[PDB]
Amino acid sequence: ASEALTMIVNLLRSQRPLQEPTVEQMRAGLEAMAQMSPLPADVELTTVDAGGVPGAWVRVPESDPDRVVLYLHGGGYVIGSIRTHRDLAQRIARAARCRVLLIDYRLAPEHPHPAAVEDSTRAYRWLLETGSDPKRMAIAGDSAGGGLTVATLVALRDAGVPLPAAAVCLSPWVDLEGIGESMTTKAVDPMVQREPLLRMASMYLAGQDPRTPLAAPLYADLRGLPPLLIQVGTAETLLDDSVRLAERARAAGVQVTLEPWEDMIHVWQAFAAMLPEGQQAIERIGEFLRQHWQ
């Protein structure tokens, strides 16, 4: 892997807090980390009300406005914002030559499950309402937002809503009990530890069964989902979330591409400004999306 990978891993290991962070400290910490990736001058961000869910359109000069990704940010269903994920969104808009609708879906512990899935499905329905064509749409997201991408598809399908052309999961989180083999064997992963992840799961579930399918889509019915790209790093505690998801989706007849990136860490694409493999993974997202929009 690139020398940049070892630099990022060493920085993250050195900066991990010595006391369990509060929700406020985690939100502020991620906002601080995301402010170090500055927004290129050619990115246009437009604040919008996505049918009752706050959002921002993200586009670049080469964006085809008829092509839309609904982007669901990560953060354990507890942290993250339009500001934390706007760099990943603009990189995807640029590679996929599309616009991205980034939504500020409701977060736990203030708004437990199923508020996040209510917001993602409402935003998608609003895109169809305002004239977006499912054949030129995709849903994408990272970690919690990768889990929420699968849950959103399941919930739309069950409601009889037309599904988009494709979906993209970046290091998806689909097992809210952390019982994947890698959630032990990969403990090489400086940003996802079992205990804090299960703390975020507890806040999202608010006493609901940790196998509730729209919260933990490892237990959802995935039949009829559109083509799925899963990008995951081999140095991830969530590796076996992506492996188990691919297995389940393929068994349900979904056209799955599982891309395991050797030695990559959790949502390495978020570090694309300085990590070559992060930009290379985002170019591959753009290629996958344009292939399914043809």
Ligand SMILES: COc1ccc2cc([C@@H](C)C(=O)O)ccc2c1
């Ligand atoms: C800047 O470097 C880090 C690295 C890992 C982190 C992990 C957490 C959470 C999951 C935690 O440790 O409870 C928070 C901040 C962090 C900051």
Ligand SMILES: COc1ccc2cc([C@@H](C)C(=O)O)ccc2c1
């Ligand atoms: C326990 O107290 C802390 C101390 C530092 C923290 C830093 C972060 C940021 C930088 C992060 O998310 O990486 C978050 C929570 C934190 C909590």
Ligand SMILES: COc1ccc2cc([C@@H](C)C(=O)O)ccc2c1
């Ligand atoms: C450098 O900029 C970032 C921006 C967002 C990030 C988000 C994550 C996790 C919490 C996520 O997938 O939401 C990690 C690193 C990140 C780095």
Ligand SMILES: COc1ccc2cc([C@@H](C)C(=O)O)ccc2c1
């Ligand atoms: C505490 O650990 C880190 C490590 C790498 C980081 C890289 C970025 C920028 C340059 C990025 O690649 O987007 C920001 C925060 C970071 C925090």
